[PDB]
Amino acid sequence: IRIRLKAYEHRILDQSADKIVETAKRTGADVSGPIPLPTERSLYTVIRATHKYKDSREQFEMRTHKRLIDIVNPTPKTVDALMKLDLPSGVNIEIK
C-alpha cells in the first residue's frame, strides 16, 4: 500500500506522517518511509501598486510539501486503521 501526503506546512505534515507510521507499526504492518518528496513551489509576482509603478513588485510563493509511505504486508486491521486515523484538514492524503 502507498500513501501520499501533501500539505502547505511541513510541520503539520510531519506530525500526520508520524501518526500514520505509528498506527501502522502498532497494527503490526511494516512501513517504508516516511520518504520526503521534492517540495513543489509556485511563484507569483504582482505589481505592489494599484496604478502604474511597474518597477516595484512583490513576490508570493505557494509551497506543497509531500511525504510518501509504503505499507508492506498489510494486515486486515491496518486498512481500516489508516482510514480511522483522521488527519488535520491542512493535509491532503492519497492512498494507492
Quote the CA–CA distance of 65 and 40 in Å, as a whole number. 7
**Judged by CB under 8 A, does residue 23 bind another protein?**
no
Per-residue string for binding with another protein, 65-84, x by CB under 8 A?
--------------------
Per DSSP, the residues of 50-80 read SSS--S-EEEEEEEEEEEEEEEES--HHHHH
CB 77 to another protein: min, Å = 24
Q: Which residues bind another protein (CB under 8 A)?
A: 6-9, 42-48, 50, 54-64, 88-92
